[PDB]
Design a binder for this molecule. Sequence first.
Ligand SMILES: CC(C)(COP(=O)(O)OP(=O)(O)OC[C@H]1O[C@@H](n2cnc3c(N)ncnc32)[C@H](O)[C@@H]1OP(=O)(O)O)[C@@H](O)C(=O)NCCC(=O)NCCS
Ligand SMILES: CC(C)(COP(=O)(O)OP(=O)(O)OC[C@H]1O[C@@H](n2cnc3c(N)ncnc32)[C@H](O)[C@@H]1OP(=O)(O)O)[C@@H](O)C(=O)NCCC(=O)NCCS
Lengths: 92, 181, 1021
Amino acid sequence: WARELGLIRKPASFMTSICDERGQELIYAGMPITEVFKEEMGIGGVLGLLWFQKRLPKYSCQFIEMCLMVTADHGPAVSGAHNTIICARAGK
Amino acid sequence: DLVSSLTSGLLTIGDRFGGALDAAAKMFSKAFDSGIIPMEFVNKMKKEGKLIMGIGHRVKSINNPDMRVQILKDYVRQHFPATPLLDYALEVEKITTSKKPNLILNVDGLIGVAFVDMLRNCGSFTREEADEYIDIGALNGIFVLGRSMGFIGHYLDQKRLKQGLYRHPWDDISYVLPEHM
Amino acid sequence: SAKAISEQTGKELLYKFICTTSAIQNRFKYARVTPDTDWARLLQDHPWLLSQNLVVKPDQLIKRRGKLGLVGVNLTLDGVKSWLKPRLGQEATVGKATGFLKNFLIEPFVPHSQAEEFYVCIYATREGDYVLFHHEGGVDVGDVDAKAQKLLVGVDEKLNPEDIKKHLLVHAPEDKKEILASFISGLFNFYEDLYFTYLEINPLVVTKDGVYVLDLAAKVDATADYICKVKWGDIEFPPPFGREAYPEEAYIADLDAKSGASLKLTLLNPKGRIWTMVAGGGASVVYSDTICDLGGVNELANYGEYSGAPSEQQTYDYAKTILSLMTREKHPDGKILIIGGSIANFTNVAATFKGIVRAIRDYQGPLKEHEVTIFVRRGGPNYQEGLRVMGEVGKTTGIPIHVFGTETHMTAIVGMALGHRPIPGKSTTLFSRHTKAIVWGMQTRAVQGMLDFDYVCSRDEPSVAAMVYPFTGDHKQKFYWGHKEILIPVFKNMADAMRKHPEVDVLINFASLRSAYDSTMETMNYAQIRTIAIIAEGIPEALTRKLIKKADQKGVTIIGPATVGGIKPGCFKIGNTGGMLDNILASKLYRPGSVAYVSRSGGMSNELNNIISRTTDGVYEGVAIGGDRYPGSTFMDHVLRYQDTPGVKMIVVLGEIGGTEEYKICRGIKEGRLTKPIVCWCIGTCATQASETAVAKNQALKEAGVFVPRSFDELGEIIQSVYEDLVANGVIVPAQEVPPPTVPMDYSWARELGLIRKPASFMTSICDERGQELIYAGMPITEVFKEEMGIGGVLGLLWFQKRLPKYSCQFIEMCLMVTADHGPAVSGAHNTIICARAGKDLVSSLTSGLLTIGDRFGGALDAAAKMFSKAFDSGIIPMEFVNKMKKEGKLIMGIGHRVKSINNPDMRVQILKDYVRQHFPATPLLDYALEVEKITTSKKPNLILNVDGLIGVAFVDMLRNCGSFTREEADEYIDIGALNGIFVLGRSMGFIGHYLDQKRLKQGLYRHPWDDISYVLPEHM
Ligand SMILES: CC(C)(COP(=O)(O)OP(=O)(O)OC[C@H]1O[C@@H](n2cnc3c(N)ncnc32)[C@H](O)[C@@H]1OP(=O)(O)O)[C@@H](O)C(=O)NCCC(=O)NCCS
Ligand SMILES: CC(C)(COP(=O)(O)OP(=O)(O)OC[C@H]1O[C@@H](n2cnc3c(N)ncnc32)[C@H](O)[C@@H]1OP(=O)(O)O)[C@@H](O)C(=O)NCCC(=O)NCCS
């Protein structure tokens, strides 16, 4: 009540310049979610919005998706995939 | 569950929280084997702009001291033969509390210098073992294994109070977004 | 603070760090004789005592021992042994001080004539250093300023021996003229290199063999240890020669040592009636001055302070020591306790009063038994509630307590106490409403105070353009402009701030003493900065004289070296001057007045704001110049700066004892320079060089047309008289009190004074970290270590919040010893080894091993407890339980092994089973589990009771069969997972061991070869 009638004051931590969840639309970096889906940017476009806070050009967006496609699975011999298999086989 | 709650608490024991246990041993033993005075070690450490690890604490001061530092000091004075690095660290502590009262020699610095004393002034560690166990990280493990009891205690307590999901209210945030990206 | 050093350490530093080609003599030939010293070690350590002639003299900072006759001259070893018998342990009398003699210095006696002894004295002043030399030294010189040749060497400049011969050695002997210049130049170089202040070598004796130094005297700038601790070493600063300290005085000295505040106590009279426990620097000397000026010279008991916001425990200890010192003697006329103080800056008055009234309620019986009268005056934030708390304790205890606030004059409290009255070129316009500053450093409290002042003084533009901090990168700090939230950029280097903001002209230097000099020397070469305020403290006198010199060169004015700043109402405020916005709005410092003032200390500036506010129309521009030795701008520069401003109508000046500046005020007003009415008072008369004392400044200023009150009780009366004369003459036209803008206060301040009531999450019934002792479950950490409960005991405190019995604590230590490492084959140890071989770190290796302890690995600690305790509370015979877990699938958890079967036990289940059967009273569930294992060993021999099942059933049995668990907490912890906690905390030792061991064998990255994979991929998806 004392801040709704506007008299108290509060220093607020956690500055977070990404993804304002309040309001009538889920705004990303500066661009709303309906603009994200109308401008037809893939997940590379929202990687540019959330991580870099820039609307990256449409060749860099496809390059970010190409990087997330080639840095997918590379066999289960390697150590991280091996630990995931050990924890899945322990049924976690 | 227990392992995910304790584990998501244990993945913050880094350099600012609780991982000063090894850097307050490496720094205080790298400035004791290249022997300077404490009053020049502090000058060098401020001149380089880096933090003296294991000398600062957010909430405790000299007018509000933490007692767990005193319980360890009164043990390492008696049962420990020949502990000079702790005396060096106490010298640096009072040099820094003469300026700012906030900067008090932590338990994360007292355990580091007392463990270097216990490794290199008791038996069975010569000088390559007792420096390998500082370089490898056997002093962060003391903090992680000690604080696991507290984190499991906090999991059990928040499980027994039947508390709900946490939401962190928007009046503690101040979103500072760009204009229109 | 330049303080004295002993002759032994002076000669030690001289003989060790001198750099001369001259023949120095008697190097490291001196002996220190104490009352506690022996003689065999002395003869073995210094052999020259058995070879030469000896001169012994007391070194307890005794001045002019020749005029007193305490010097042993030309004696043998038995000569000094027979002469030191009435000198060691006898209370000597020197000047006006009778004190113990406990220190003597022995020198080799030298042969010398009257024409060999000279006088060298290098003492520091504001412009530079004075090298004073006299060709006729000794004790009977007398006139130390009327005969000798002086030479002023400027700051940041060197002294050449040709200049010594030209100005200083004109009347030296010719057979000493070549070596004396070398010794004086080396002595000056050593003086400048070790940061002394006043070095007096008398009497120096240059003879044919070399140079002897008979007596020495030296004061060293004690705050230059951060630059010269390697050259000083362990300096033992001696106290002045006087009476030995009382143990309570030494107790408060120890409190000041181990505290962060300033806790001073000195008992002038342990029998008298007037005790004064007054917080503040200048507040204590002002209260003792108006005790002295009201007939209380002889019966003033103590004087001291508790300044700089002490903790509640520390102010309780100080007030307890004062209330115990005023208790042991009786005074039937009546004892008076003046718990005074000025307006505090930011401290909540109710907390310090809470400490003092704890010390009062601890001494209420003796305080009524000894007829005390407590007079309290305090101001600042929440002084209303603080004085109301003190009035509540005065009502409830029954002792007379008289609380006064900002409405009272500062020292009329001691007026109504003793029975005297009843109890009821440089610039001028430095600061403007377009003046933007640059703060240097992370001082967000001071910057938010300045921005709150800029809001409330009706100023449309913030007076912090940017902050500068090189230890972090460039970012944008979040600050509060009224209700609004603004971003203020903190820059790494000052070049970016002076590039993007060319409108600034003032840098507020909040760097510490180890970076303030370099920061303002980096600042002073920038053209836009025309004033510099250095708020730090500890900066040495040599570095601040170099700052004064470069400020006079570059034309900037400096209000730095130990200050709080200075406030110009309506335009600007330097950091933390004034205090909170409560103080700014109560003292009406938001609209421009017509009075200017100068002070030296920053503690009396708030009282000056209060007095001018209550008795005048406001303050136009007020400045405190600093609490250092050589202030960056003295009183006369600010009075001349006030003279050229069209807004000032009168000027108040608050001076102090020491330093000749009010004489410059006298000469400036007499030589036709000052016209506006000056009011002044020099605080701290209290004299119970005599040409620069406070009564000298008062008698000098009273005659010279300056309005000077008699005591400090009448300062506001004099200022009100001068103001009502100036409003009768029609020059002062007071404006109308426009209402200011309002700021919201603070969530922290509103909860501290207690009117907000926010609901708090995170209920946490464990480990109260706050307060003074790390409290565990309900028991402090000192009781944890005193009652010898191990890590099982602190597990019972943190996890279960009960005091577990000593067999159960040792049982939990036994469980954490058996559930440690069990080989690296297992899933969690394997994951820890793979993350350690991928070179990660301890917490990610242990953590990614700990994320396997679920159901199939580490789940038998809890499943074999829930199973054996569900099927024991349902009343089932062990044969029926084995058959019930047969028809439903469901192999019994906690039963089975791979090798150790029977007549070949587990040998770590046997240790736990032995401990439980020997120590646990009334263990039914282990006996039920042993009946089940006796039934199921008949099927297969290797169906022995596992250790993961035995710890489960022994733990459930311990919880529901020992004390302090009922039965519904005793299976609540089983349901929540205290057994999973036992396994995870046990196996963490093994996983950290595996991390360290794979880090120590220096293993490489793991690849898991394709011979052990067998890909079973589809055909073409
Ligand atoms: C833990 C820590 C963040 C707490 O410090 P803090 O109370 O927040 O102090 P702040 O960072 O708010 O204030 C910064 C000022 O104090 C200085 N300072 C703070 N901690 C310092 C430290 N350990 N060593 C040297 N200087 C320190 C900063 O240099 C800076 O100086 P300045 O006044 O000239 O600007 C910090 O001291 C630290 O990182 N210590 C090393 C890690 C550690 O020991 N952690 C155990 C306790 S959590
Ligand atoms: C048939 C044979 C292979 C079975 O041997 P086995 O040791 O009983 O092996 P099993 O796996 O069947 O034993 C499991 C038993 O222990 C029980 N058990 C196993 N794990 C259990 C657990 N955690 N908890 C409770 N019970 C468990 C099982 O329920 C079962 O008991 P059940 O009979 O009540 O069902 C054995 O008898 C044999 O070797 N026969 C060949 C001999 C021969 O003729 N040789 C040729 C002549 S030269």
